[PDB]
Structures are given as C-alpha cells and as structure tokens.
Amino acid sequence: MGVADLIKKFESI
Amino acid sequence: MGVADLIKKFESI
Amino acid sequence: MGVADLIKKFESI
Amino acid sequence: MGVADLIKKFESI
Amino acid sequence: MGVADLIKKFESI
Amino acid sequence: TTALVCDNGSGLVKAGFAGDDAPRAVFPSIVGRPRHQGVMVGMGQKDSYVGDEAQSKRGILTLKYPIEHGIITNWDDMEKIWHHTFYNELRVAPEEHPTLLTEAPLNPKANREKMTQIMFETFNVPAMYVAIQAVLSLYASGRTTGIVLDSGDGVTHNVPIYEGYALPHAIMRLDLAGRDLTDYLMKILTERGYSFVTTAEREIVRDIKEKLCYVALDFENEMATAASSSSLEKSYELPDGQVITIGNERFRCPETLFQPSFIGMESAGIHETTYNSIMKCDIDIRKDLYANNVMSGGTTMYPGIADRMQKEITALAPSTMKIKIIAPPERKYSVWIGGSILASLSTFQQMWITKQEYDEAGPSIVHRKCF
Amino acid sequence: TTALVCDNGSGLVKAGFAGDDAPRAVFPSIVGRPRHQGVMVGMGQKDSYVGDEAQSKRGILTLKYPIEHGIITNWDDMEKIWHHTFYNELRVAPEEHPTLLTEAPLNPKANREKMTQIMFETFNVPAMYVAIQAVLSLYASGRTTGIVLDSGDGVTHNVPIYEGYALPHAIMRLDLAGRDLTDYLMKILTERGYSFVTTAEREIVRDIKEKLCYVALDFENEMATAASSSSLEKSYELPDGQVITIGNERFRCPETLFQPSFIGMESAGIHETTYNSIMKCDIDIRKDLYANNVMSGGTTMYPGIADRMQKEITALAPSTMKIKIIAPPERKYSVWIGGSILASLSTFQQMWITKQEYDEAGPSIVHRKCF
Amino acid sequence: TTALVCDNGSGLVKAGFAGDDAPRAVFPSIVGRPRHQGVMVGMGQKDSYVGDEAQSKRGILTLKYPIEHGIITNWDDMEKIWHHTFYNELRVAPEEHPTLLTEAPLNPKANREKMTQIMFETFNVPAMYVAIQAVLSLYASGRTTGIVLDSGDGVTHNVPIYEGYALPHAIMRLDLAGRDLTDYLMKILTERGYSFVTTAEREIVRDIKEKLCYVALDFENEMATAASSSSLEKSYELPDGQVITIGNERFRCPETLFQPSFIGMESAGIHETTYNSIMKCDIDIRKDLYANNVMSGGTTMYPGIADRMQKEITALAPSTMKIKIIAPPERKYSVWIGGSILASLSTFQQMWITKQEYDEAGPSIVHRKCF
Amino acid sequence: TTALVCDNGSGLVKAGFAGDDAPRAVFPSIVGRPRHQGVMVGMGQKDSYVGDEAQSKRGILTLKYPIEHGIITNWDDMEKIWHHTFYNELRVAPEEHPTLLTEAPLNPKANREKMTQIMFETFNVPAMYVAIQAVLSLYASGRTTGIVLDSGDGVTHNVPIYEGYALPHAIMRLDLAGRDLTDYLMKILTERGYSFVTTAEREIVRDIKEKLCYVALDFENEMATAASSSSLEKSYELPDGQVITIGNERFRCPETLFQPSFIGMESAGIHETTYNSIMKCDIDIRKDLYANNVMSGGTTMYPGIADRMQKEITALAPSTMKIKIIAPPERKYSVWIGGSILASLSTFQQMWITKQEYDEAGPSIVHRKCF
Amino acid sequence: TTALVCDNGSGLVKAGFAGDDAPRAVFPSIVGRPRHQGVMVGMGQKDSYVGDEAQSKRGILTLKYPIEHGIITNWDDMEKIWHHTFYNELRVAPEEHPTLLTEAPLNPKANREKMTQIMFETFNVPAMYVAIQAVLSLYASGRTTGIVLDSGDGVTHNVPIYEGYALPHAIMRLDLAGRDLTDYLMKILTERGYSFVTTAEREIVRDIKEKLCYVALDFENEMATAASSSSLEKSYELPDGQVITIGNERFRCPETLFQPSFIGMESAGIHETTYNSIMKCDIDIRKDLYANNVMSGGTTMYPGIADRMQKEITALAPSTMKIKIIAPPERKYSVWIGGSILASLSTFQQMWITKQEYDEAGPSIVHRKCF
Numbered sequence A, B, C, D, E: 001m002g003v004a005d006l007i008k009k010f011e012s013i
Numbered sequence F, G, H, I, J: 001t002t003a004l005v006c007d008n009g010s011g012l013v014k015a016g017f018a019g020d021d022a023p024r025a026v027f028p029s030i031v032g033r034p035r036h037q038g039v040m041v042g043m044g045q046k047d048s049y050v051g052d053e054a055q056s057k058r059g060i061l062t063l064k065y066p067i068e069h070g071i072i073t074n075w076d077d078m079e080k081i082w083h084h085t086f087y088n089e090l091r092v093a094p095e096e097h098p099t100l101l102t103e104a105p106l107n108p109k110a111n112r113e114k115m116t117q118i119m120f121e122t123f124n125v126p127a128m129y130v131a132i133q134a135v136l137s138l139y140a141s142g143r144t145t146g147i148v149l150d151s152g153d154g155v156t157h158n159v160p161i162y163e164g165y166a167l168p169h170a171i172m173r174l175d176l177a178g179r180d181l182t183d184y185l186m187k188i189l190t191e192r193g194y195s196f197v198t199t200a201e202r203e204i205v206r207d208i209k210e211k212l213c214y215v216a217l218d219f220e221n222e223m224a225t226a227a228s229s230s231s232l233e234k235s236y237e238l239p240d241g242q243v244i245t246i247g248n249e250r251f252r253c254p255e256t257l258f259q260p261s262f263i264g265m266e267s268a269g270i271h272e273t274t275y276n277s278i279m280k281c282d283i284d285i286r287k288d289l290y291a292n293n294v295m296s297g298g299t300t301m302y303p304g305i306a307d308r309m310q311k312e313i314t315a316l317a318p319s320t321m322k323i324k325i326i327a328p329p330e331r332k333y334s335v336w337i338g339g340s341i342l343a344s345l346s347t348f349q350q351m352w353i354t355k356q357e358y359d360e361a362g363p364s365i366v367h368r369k370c371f
C-alpha cells in the first residue's frame, strides 16, 4: 500500500 | 378581487 | 410532388 | 487413425 | 501592567 | 356551519369567519402583566391583559410577545390569546366552528404539533387544518404561478410556486422583518439622542416606523440628500406630546432589509434572496417567476419597496426579460384572505383533519403537508 | 371512410388522414409526470401530460420518452400517446377508421405484435396494416429504384429497393441519430461550461442542435478555422434569457454522424454504411443505386449533410460514375407522406388486416411483410 | 511633544500626560454656584467653583453636574471644566499637546461634534482623536479579545471586541450606575429617617455609599441576616459629627444594579445585559468572550461585585464553560490608562485628526469611527 | 529535484512532495475577509486569511470558497491559496520544483488553460502536468482496471478504466457531494429549530455532519426506528457549549446522496449513476468493473456507505455476478497519494509540459489529454 | 530437422510440428488495436494484439480479421500473425524449420506468390511447399478416393479426388460458412431484440452459434414445433451475466447453409453444390464418390448436419445407390492433421520448394501444382 511499493509496481509493469 | 370571486375562480379551475 | 399526383402515378403503374 | 499410422499407410502405398 | 510594558507589547504586535 | 379562519401572526392576530372579505379581530399578539405594585384594591382588576387592552394599559404594564419568528415561546400566554380570540372577539363557540391556522415554513414541527394538541384538547375544536402562508398569499392574489415574498413581524421567507406545484428546495427564509427593523430603528433614533428603552417605547417606535419610514430607490443618493438638505426631515409627536424629529433614519431603517449588514447579518438582502431562490428553480420556471413576483404584506407595506425590488432584480437578472412585481393594497390581509378563500373551497373540505383522525393518526397527520 | 395513417416516431408522433398533404398531429412523443409536490389542490390537475402540454409543463415535470430506438418500452404511456392522438388531436372515432402504422426495420417482432394487439383490443380498430418506413420514403420520393437513408430521433437505417423489390440482406441499421447527437452536444457544451442536466435542459439542447448545427465539408479545415477565428461562433438565448455562445461545437456535433468514434461506437459512419449497403447489392443494381440515394429526413435536415455525403461517396465509390443524392425539403414528413400515399392506393387495400383475420390468424399475419 | 489624554467621566475628570502611569487631575466633574447671599465683599470671591474647590465650598454652594449619562448638558460649565483642567491642573499649553478624548458608546453624534468644535476653535488644539472607552479598557487590560462592562457615574454599557474587531450590534447600554444608585440610597436611608436632601448631602451619601456599601452574593440570605441580626450594621460619622447607623441598606443599594426594578426600570440587570450582549455575538466568539469579561471600574469597585457577577453569569450561561472575570484594582483608572497607552503607540499617530482635516472634512471625519 | 504534487479540492487543498506517503498541507480551501469593523489599529492585521487561520478567525470573518463544483470562480483568492501553499506551508521555491495539478473531468477547458497560465507566468514554474483524478485514484488503489466513484466537497463523478484505457463516453458526473449535503443538513436541523445561518455555522454543521452522520442500509426501517424509539438520537456540543440533539436527521442527510430528490434534483443516485456508467461500457468490460469499484474518498468516508452501495448495485445489476467495492481508509488522501505515485514514475517524466512548450504550443498542449 | 506445418484459417490459425497428432497453436486469426484512449502510461503497453491476447482485450479493442474468404487482405497483420506464431507460440527459429502452408482452391495466384515471397524473404525459411486443403483432408481421412466438403470460417468448397487424381473442373466453391452464418445469426437474434453490434459482440455471437445451434432434419417441422411449443427454447448467459433466450433461431441459423437465399445468395446449398460437383465428374467416378463424402470440419461441427446432408443427397441422387458421409469428430483439426501426415511422408520431401529454386524459377514454381 505504501507509495514506494506502488511506484515500484507500476515501474515494474 | 373580492373573496367570493376568487373562490368561484378556483372552484371553477 | 403533391400526394394526389403520386397516388395517380403509382395507381397508373 | 493416429497420424503415425496414416503416414505408414501412405508410405506403404 | 505598567503603561510602558503595554505600549511595547502592542507596538510589538 | 361557517368555518373559522385564524392567522396567528408574530405581531398581529387576525381572526375572521370563512368566506368573509376581511378579518374581524386584528388585535395585537400581546400579553401584559403589571410590573408596578397595585394599591387600589378596586382597580387591580386583572393580573394579565390581551393586546388591545394591554396596549392602553402598557404604560404601567410590561409587554411580552408570545411568538418569536413564527415560533411560540410562551404557550400559556398563547392560550390566553386564543381564548380571548374565540370568546371575547369572535363571540363564537369553537365546538361548532372548524378552524384553519397558519404558520411560517421551515418552522419546528413541535410547534405545529403542540398548537394542534391545544386546539383539539383544550378548545374541543371538531376539525382543523394548518396551511402555508405563501399558498394563501397566492390564493389571495388570484394566480397559481408565483414567487411569494413574505415579511410579517417575524419571518421573512421566499417561496416559489408553479402551476400549483411547490418547490421545497427553493424556499429561503430570513428571521428579520418587523421586530429587528424596529429595534434597529430604536438604535438609530438613539443616534439622535431619543432614548427609547421600554417595551411601551418599543411600541411607540413601531408606530413611528409604520408611519414615517419609506424605502430609498438609491440609498447613496438619499444619504447625500439628507446630508446636503433638511427636506427629508419629518416631525412626529409622542404620546406625551413631546416632538421627535427624524431625517435620514427614515429610509435607513427599511434599507436594512436590503443590507442586513446593518444588523450584522451576512445573509444577502431580500432582492438577492429572491434572485437566488429563482436561480434554485429549474430554468424554464424562471421566466414565469419573474413575471409573477408577489408580496405577502406586513413590512412590504413600505413606500417604494416594490420599485426598489424591481430595480434590484432587473439589475441582478438577465436583460430582455420582463420582471414584474404584484403587491395589492390588501397584501397585509392577503394571507388571511387566502385562508378565507381556501377554507370556503368545496374541493378543499376533504383536506380537513377531523378529531377522529387526530385521535387515531396521533399528531403525525398534521405533518402531511408540512412543506 | 377515410383511412387513418399514424407514424409513431421515436421523438415525434405524426398522424394524418390518408391523401392529405401533411400530418395534422406533430406533437412530441413525450409523457411527463410531476417530480415536485403539489399543494394548490385546484392546480394539481393531472398526474400525467402529453407531449405538447408536457413541454410547457416540463419545467416542473420529469419527461420520459416511451420509445427508445424504435422500440416501445412503456406501453402504458404509449397507450396514453395513442389515446390523445385519436381523441384529442384527430377528434376521430377509431371504430370507423382503419389504420396504417409505421416501424423501423429489424425491430423486435414482439413490438409489432403488442402494438397490433393494443390497436384491435383496446381501440377496436376494424382494420390495420404495418408498413416499412423506407418504402414509404420511396413513395414520397416518386420512384421505385432507390437506396434510402433514414435517421429519425432513434434509428438510422439504410434500405435498398430496386423496381419495388427489397433486398433484406442489404439492410443496415444504426441506433444513433437525434438522441445520441443531442447527448453528445450536451457533453461538448459542457466542455465550455454550460451545465445542462435536466430532461428539460435536454429539450433545450435539442432545440439548440436543431437550429445551430451545420455539417462540415472538411472537418479538419473547419477545426483549424474555429481555432484561428471566431467567425464560426454563434449566440443563442436560453428560455430564462441567459445567452449561450457556441463555436466549433456546432459542426462537431453532426460530424459525429460520420465519426461515431466520438460516441465510442466502432460502426462506420452513415457514408460508409451507405457504401457498404450498396456493395451488398448485386453488381448491376449499384449503378442505379448511386443515381438514386434518397434521404428520409429527421437528422438529415442539417445544412451541408448532402454535400458532405456526396463528397464521401464519390471518394469511396469508383470514379466515372454518377453519384446523386435526393433529399427534398419535405424529407422529414416524407415517411408520413409515403404512408398517406400508400393507404390511398386502390391496389393496396387488400393488404389490410381485418379484425376477423386477427381473430383467426392470431398475430402472425402482421409478420407477413415483416421485412 | 507629549500628547495629552483626557477622560471626561460623568462624575470624575481624569487628565494625564501620555505614557504616564496615572492621571494627574482626578477632580470631580462638578461646578457649584452660591445659593446663599454674599455679604463679606472680600469673601464672595467667585460666582462659580470647580469640583475640588466646589466640594469644600458645597456647604454654601448648590452643585450641578454638567454631564448626564455621558451627555453634556451645560457646555459653558464643561468649557470651564476643561479650561481649569488644562491651565490650573496640568500647567500645560494645549497649542502644543495633541489630545485624546473619551465618550460612551451610542452617544448622540451632536455631542462628539460639539466637543470637537470646542476643542479646535476654543483651545486651538493642533491635533485630536476621539476614542471609545471599551477599546481603551482593553488596552489597559493587556488583551485584544474581550467583552467590556463599564459603569461610571452615569452610563453602564457592554461592548464585545474580538481580535480588535468590534461588534456594533452587540453593544448594550443602561443609563443607571452611580447617580441612580446614590439617589436610591438616599431614599432607603430616608426609610430610617435620615433626611438627606441637598446636593451637598447627596455628596455625603455618595461617600457613605463608596465606603459602606457591599454587594450581596445571595440577596435574600442577606435580607434574612439583617432582619435576624445586627451583625451587618455599621456606624458612620457625618461631617458635623452626627452619627448615622445603617444595616440592610448597605447591600440593598448596590443590589439595585442587578435589580433595576427597585428603580422601577424594567431593563434586566448588568448580568443579564452582559449575557444578552454575548448572545448577540456570533456563536464562536462567545467562548472567548466568557474567558475575557473585563470590568471598567467606577461602580464596579464595590466589594463582592465580581463574585456576584460570576455567580449570575454561570447561572445564566450553559454549564461546562469557563466564565472568567478580569477586574484589576486600577479598573477605575483603567479607561485613562488605556488612553495613555493608545496615544503613545507609534502605529496610532496617523489616527490623529488634525486641525487642517477639521478645516477641510468639516465635522464629519469625527464620525469615521463613531461606532 | 523533488517534484511537487498539488491536489486542489473543492473544499480541501492537499500539497505534498512526490514520494511522500501523505500530504503536508491539508488546510481548507477557504479565504475569509472581515465583515466586522476593525477598531484596535494594532489588531486588524490582515484584510484576508487562509483556511486554517481563517477557520479560527471565522467567528468574525465571512468565509468564501474559491472553487465551486471543481470550477475556479475567484482566481485572485486561488492565487492567494497557492501562494500560501508554496511559501507558507511547503517552504519551497517553485522555480526549482515542477508541479502536478489535479482537476475534475468534464471541466471547462478555460479553467485548465487559466490555471496553467497562472502557474507558468505568475510562479515561473519550470514544468507542469495536469492529471485526471480517477487515474490518480487507481494508482492509489494499486490496480489498472477499475471504475472510480468520487465525491469531494463539490463534484461527484464516475469514470471507468480498463487496462489503463479510459472510456470518455462512459463518464458520468453529478455536482452534489459535501456542500449540498451540508446545506440540506442545515435545513433538516432547522426542522428541529436549531437556526444555523452564517458560513461559520455552515462550518459547524459540516463538523456535525462529519461526526454524527451515518448511512442507512434500509432508509424506511431507520425512519420507523427513529419514529418509534430514541435509540438513534445523539447529542453534540456547539462551540459555545450549547447542546444540540439529533435523531433521524443523522441518516436522512447522507441518504440524500442516494435520493437527490430531497435536493430536488432528478438525476438518479450514486448507485444508479454507477450502474448506468457500467452499462455505457462495452459488455465484456462490465464484469471486471463490478470486481473493481473504487471510492475516491471525501463524502464516501461515511459509515455504512459501502454496504449500502453494495446492496443497491446488487439489486440493480443481474444476479450471479460478483459485485465488490474497494474503499480504503486512505480514500480521501488517495487522490493525492495517486499524484505522489504518478509524479515519481520514471516513465511519466516525459509527460511533463515545459515552459518552452507552453511558450510554443500556446495553451493547447494542456488539452492533449483533456479527457 | 522437424518440419513445420501451418494451416492459416480464415478464423483460426493452426500451427504444429510434423508428425504430431494435434496442433499446438490454435489461436484466433485476429489482430486488435485499441479504439479507446490510453491514459495510464504504464498500461497502454501495445498498439496491437494477437488473437488470444486480443480476445481478452477485445472489450477495449477493435478486432479485425486479416483474411477474408481465404484471401489475405492485410499482409502487415498477417506477418504479425506469423511472427507471433513462430516466436511466441512455437518457440522455434524458422531459419532451420521448413514449412508447409495451406490455401483454399481457386484462390488468386498473387496471394500464393506474395505469401511465398514473404516466407522466404522475411522469415528466411529454407524450404516451403503449398498444399491444397482437400488433399490434406483425404490424407487425414485415410483414403485416396473421396469428395471433400469444406467449410472454415470463410470459404466453402467441394473437391473430388479419385485414386489420387484431382478433377479441376469439378471443383465448386462458395464464399459463405462461419462468418456469414454468424452475421445472419446476429440479424436473427436482432429479431428478438438482442442488439449485438461490436466485433466483440460478434465474437460473443460466434460463441452462441458454436454452442446453441443445431441443424434441422425437417426445417418446416421444426418451425412448426418452435411456433407451437417452447420446448426448443434455450437460455444462455452473456459475459456480463445478462440472460438471453433463444428458440427457432437456433436451427434457423445453420439451415442457411442449405438455403443461402436467406443470405440473398442464389447459389444452391451445400447439398446441391455437392450433387452438382458429383455430376461434373465422369459417370463411373460418381458411384465411388457417393461412398466417400468427407467433411472438412469447421462449421460442419453442427449437430445434425451429417444426417441432413445424407437426407438431401438421397433425395437428390438416384435411388438404389449407397450414399455415405464420413465426418470424424476431429474433422476441424483434420485439415491440419492431413498437413502433419503429408509433410512427414518420405515420398513428399522432393515437393519442397527451396530458396534456391525460388531464387531461380522466380515465383512461378509455386504455381506448378496451383490446381
């Protein structure tokens, strides 16, 4: 949920 | 304008 | 163009 | 019906 | 409470 | 079986038999009780007085209004008011005379419930209805598409009606009108040094307001006129024969309908409240509303008020659109006159609430058309 | 024994006596019922209203169409529409007046069955037929080889006819036209900040569309013109006198006939749908179809539409081939006019379905020419 | 260039150099003129006397106050008062010493105009301002959110201030305080048979009031105590050595601040006037007002007054809300002290009205902040 | 070079440095200017105040919102808001900090142009982008197929997204949410006689709403419960310590999200608006939309809202289909959190608009993704 | 050195390694490209999609087939299809894997040339052959005297073979089969009012066809059964969970193989086309052809099709003659299976065309067995 995790998720996608 | 006339007006409507 | 004229045209056909 | 059998059939023919 | 102190307070404000 | 119609105003009580052209009782909504000590045992005849008798007595009496801003705050005195209304004024036995009663919109529902409970249980009235003053004002004004502006002694409110359908969201209300204008006039007259303080002097200032006050068409021009010239000044004679002289104060008082900032209120004036209420209405409605802007009397008796309102609304609303303001001379009575019409209508009578229904639906049936 | 001819449009109802040059009823396909509370008991006269009366009332009313895309979705209101059509508009007693009715092609068969069942059982109509609007459009256009483009309020459809023979496979239909163009115009006007929301405001936007919109000959050139210059801008005045100003939006709305992508539809525009329908036709037919491309009115009233269509078809079709588009000014009425002709034809009358046949063939006889 | 600060009380005149901690002139607001015949030609030295000299002389003199209830009713004697204030007391040449002057709120505007006209034309003062006593009381009390209660010899008034913004509608004023309390004390002491009649005896009764009177916390309990026991009784010695003995009368006099019914006034006491003034204020303001209730001296010097006020306000106001009353021992001087602060402020000096401005704006500039 | 992310809500402004987990500024979207007269010259320190300071001051101040329904109607105050946001709150020099800004969909294009023009010309910001709040809400919700429901202080809107492709035709918007719910709550509380009128009292009623209000699962059952029992009643304490008691009104306020008829709007509730937006979507999309119904905070903080929505959608939509509603506790911040994510993405940075591009493409480049 | 075998169907692509019993790739002959706007920059991952991925995406995507009626009309997308087939599906480097490819008979020779040119020049395939689908169907059916009936998504064709000799004049071909049957099913389902329009909905209607449709043995008896009884009706559930109900339409769709008049074609049905093709054959051949009537899958998967065909041919052909129809359950794969057999045969390999030969005979060598 943390912002860093979402960033890393979309940058991975 | 008289009350009777207004009554007859609304009862007619 | 009048309706009667078109009627007479198709009834003739 | 198997593909190998049909192959062997036509190669025999 | 002295007048000078109140003056300095409001002039500061 | 002539129905009764009673309008309980914040400042004046108006009671009349249904189908009559005018009310018969018009006495003030006032109860008074002596502040001073009684000594002549033959003369301290009553502990309490009703508004007409109470007005003459007021010089000794303290006066209280039982209604504030269409809300009833002293039910005991209100029962006194109704008791005197039925027995002393109308000489009528309410057991046989079903009754129509009026209220401002957006009033507390408890007020209507308690009033109805009193009417049935205390007076044994056999049938009752409660009606909304704007609808009565439209019946009095002979039309079924209107926006109504009201200002009694207490409430000011704006209600739009179209083809007899009411727009509950477009309603707008100000607790202002007569009483606040009177108090502000007391303060302004204090600016000249006429110290008025007592409730009796409040009633004197009310009479001063009702006679002398007029509404400016251009407030700044009037202020400049009163500054530059005495021609606006008037004199008035107090009950003791003392003379009071008044100038700009006259128009400055009703101007505080348009500018409640002079009371310290932030709510926009009656003109902007009317315009905003029209804006709340769906777009097509607006054209017919501008054609049919109806005034419900009370404070709207002032000179110039309709012209000032028309000037303001024409400034606010788009051009190329007829803006027309309807304000008959009967506009003050017009709420009662509307009730007198409505109660008479053969179609209406099934709207009555019967004592059986009140004994069966509880109160809640009075809410049916609470609006 | 004058037959009746009734065209039930998705947006306008058109009903007329056979052999007359024009419809008599043209009122909107609209029923309205008050959203707002009634209070004036003398004025809440009706719970429902028919399209002409309902349009004036619409400012209070919610409006609903009983037809969506040539499909009838509220039979109760549709019975109201027909009842008012026969008694109030045409002043005619349907016991004596056999009736012609219209439908879009590829409609649900249940719709035709239910309409026929209502017509016989409820109205006691003695004879009926249902006719296909493209054929009526060709009778109105005096010719028996044509391709017909239609666009009412609801359906758009293309039907080819040759020597009076119809090509059922070549039919093509889009559920688009007036209503979707109006909604898209609401969204585009929202781009400028004119918030239109109510069904009344939907009707206002419909009137805006019908007056202001024109069809571009070169959409990209027009977009560049509107970006570079204000010369395309127009002003219009809403019912409340507010002024609305509109620019590129005018041509951008009807352009979404050619580019349904702006609605999010993938189906090709009316030009490509016409061309593809021509391609469905057998090769020899095509030459005569290009010579006889007939427009069935409604949305095809727009300025420029025929020139844009001619440009598109000439781009799509092979060169060295005459492409000609027939769109009389009566094109909107032309469906009704075709019905008025067809019902009059002495040859036609044996096409009638009689109440005996409906009482014996069941419904199914109405399907005979379902097309 | 030391500014002058003059507070013109209804009973005491207080004049001091700006930035000083206390006034220098504190003499009574009194002029006296001999009622008796002069015979010793060497001894009838003056036809008129100023308050300190006039007090000793009062046994021969008749005394008059030039101010009644913050209103100036003898401008000639008021000019005498100011002339003696500037030349005899402060030994200062007002040509060089710009002046701050005080007034009660809701005073007649003519009073401020006439005072200013005298100040410029008669004394040739080079710059002037007029300031509102509540604002000075807040400067003296070191805070900028307050409600101020004042009671000099004449006016009682309540003014709310929040963040230095004043609430003109929330102002409330009573013409009561010292003088009326003194007269009522004369009547009550008459109940015991001490006939005091002359204005000199009025001054004696004023001194009796100022020493002996104390404010009840529970008036009925005190009445029962004085009825049941002598322990509340005090003795005092008049200037001629006669002894006067006083009981319940002591607390009964200041109790008539809370119960003006003993004067025959109907206006609610200072506690209820404070509460109502707080209620006039917008809802959020009230919490900070209850925290900052400031007393402006004069009659609020009485013993017990602050405790009684706190008890009353806590009874009137909702529970669970801090009600706090600020009343320094300097509270009487505090109006002057506030003026002494205000005149010193570097920010203030542009607030001065200069003789040039009075020679150009006419009077009207004095109204700019009339409040 | 930390990017800035600013979400300009209709009621709250949220500004934060990219990659932070929460906004730092959360102050109200409010500017206030004193209605009351200043008198303490040292204290009338500012003519205008920003929402946090303005809230404490509100008891004197009039409050105005610069945004109405996601539209900016006072650019001067909006520049005040941003100036205070950047310098006072974030202590950041915008010359170095490129900025992301948010807007509601279907806004006027002029609003985006004017905002961008201010951002470049007034603040000299070196790079900017404008992003659509639904997309930010999906980034905050960790998924790329969603339908987003939003309700800030102003707009309510529904946007469907599938595999990161947006469906512009499926968008649906209602101008409703917090402000209209607050005003309706003011009227309902007026039904009990708690007269709230000022904008300060509007803010008090907003706090009352935010604490007390809960959403019914069965509105008629709750109405019967509140009629039959007091168990739903709550008490609350106003800033002046007065106690207010509230019953059915609590759930009746948020129920007017589902039934805008109580406002007089005809647009179907948020449940039916969601369902209709889903119906606009192509048939396959719908299944995944029902699995991913995301709430964008603001008013959707209410208790029970998600359960009521699920009940309504399951009633509206076909059976045998999973309907699932995602509403994290951060849902209010989630728009900002989405911006904080989006600005950080390495893929995103080429989406920036640079002052060069604004100086070369004119405005129009801001429209590129206007949606 | 495993040979490749690729069957390029009009609707499904089937690619498999030689000697395997089944294809490995079976994905749809589909390319899709987003019609909708991308907004999530991380998610608009591809501008184009291949049939399996494109099917899930289809709700956003527009879908196009690159083949129409065994003709290749978008070579770019066809290269996309083959590229994905070889690299993504078969994980094979075509530089080493010589390939067999299939085509309908009577195709344009340019199509075979262009396909071969692409295969050698773009993919660098070292050897190739093109084979005729009827011959593959006979290898799959284990016999060397047959008449083959084919119906893929596009072409229907009939080819007679006797002792391995082909009769080029007896070939007969119809451009009909799956796609036209699907479109006709869309129209028929429109008769009930299920409006299917998009290519995604076309794929849904294809699935409806593939499950629900069955072939009548006596079309008129089935029509009477469906008219008289609901027992033929079936329900199906669309992807959004909506329920669709279907009756006569089920058998009416495949019946339009036998009666292409329902498409508007005049060419006789597959039964009469088979009989006429048999009549083209020399008289002795016919007897053995009736014994060996082989079905090539695709649309011939329908229930009842073989029984209906046998009934029709026995009605058409002379009595006293064995008519026998061979249709294994693998009949759809049977074309690929035939290719898998043919490529394996040691005798076959000299049929390969080598890149040298294509570089020396020009194209024309591909024509050698064009048939």
Ligand SMILES: Nc1ncnc2c1ncn2[C@@H]1O[C@H](COP(=O)(O)OP(=O)(O)O)[C@@H](O)[C@H]1O
Pocket: F008, F009, F010, F011, F012, F013, F151, F152, F153, F154, F155, F177, F178, F179, F206, F209, F210, F211, F213, F297, F298, F299, F300, F301, F302, F332
């Ligand atoms: N000539 C007048 N000019 C202005 N106001 C007037 C005049 N005559 C009466 N009024 C005002 O009319 C008000 C009473 O109107 P009404 O509608 O009866 O109020 P309510 O119904 O609440 O008693 C009072 O405020 C009274 O001062």
Ligand SMILES: Nc1ncnc2c1ncn2[C@@H]1O[C@H](COP(=O)(O)OP(=O)(O)O)[C@@H](O)[C@H]1O
Pocket: G008, G009, G010, G011, G012, G013, G151, G152, G153, G154, G155, G177, G178, G179, G206, G209, G210, G211, G213, G297, G298, G299, G300, G301, G302, G303, G332
């Ligand atoms: N001047 C105009 N320009 C464009 N469209 C128009 C104009 N006037 C009317 N229309 C459209 O014509 C349509 C009605 O045509 P009609 O053939 O009666 O439809 P229907 O038969 O389905 O009711 C409506 O969509 C209306 O908006």
Ligand SMILES: Nc1ncnc2c1ncn2[C@@H]1O[C@H](COP(=O)(O)OP(=O)(O)O)[C@@H](O)[C@H]1O
Pocket: I008, I009, I010, I011, I012, I013, I029, I151, I152, I153, I154, I155, I177, I178, I179, I206, I209, I210, I211, I296, I297, I298, I299, I300, I301, I302, I303, I332
């Ligand atoms: N506990 C709560 N219950 C209901 N509504 C709330 C609550 N807390 C805040 N709100 C509402 O949230 C809204 C502000 O949400 P926000 O998304 O910031 O709107 P905007 O972005 O338009 O400023 C206001 O209408 C406020 O009343």
Ligand SMILES: Nc1ncnc2c1ncn2[C@@H]1O[C@H](COP(=O)(O)OP(=O)(O)O)[C@@H](O)[C@H]1O
Pocket: J008, J009, J010, J011, J012, J013, J029, J151, J152, J153, J154, J155, J177, J178, J179, J206, J209, J210, J211, J296, J297, J298, J299, J300, J301, J302, J332
């Ligand atoms: N159960 C079924 N019933 C009827 N038709 C079917 C069924 N399953 C698949 N089909 C049809 O098979 C056709 C595909 O067959 P195929 O021989 O692969 O054609 P092609 O080779 O031209 O792609 C499509 O038209 C599809 O609708």
Ligand SMILES: [Mg+2]
Pocket: F009, F010, F151, F152, F153, F154, F298
């Ligand atoms: Mg009144």
Ligand SMILES: [Mg+2]
Pocket: G009, G010, G151, G152, G153, G298, G335
């Ligand atoms: Mg039509």
Ligand SMILES: [Mg+2]
Pocket: H009, H010, H151, H152, H153, H298, H335
């Ligand atoms: Mg004093």
Ligand SMILES: [Mg+2]
Pocket: I009, I010, I151, I152, I153, I298, I335
């Ligand atoms: Mg928000």
Ligand SMILES: [Mg+2]
Pocket: J009, J010, J151, J152, J153, J298
């Ligand atoms: Mg095939």
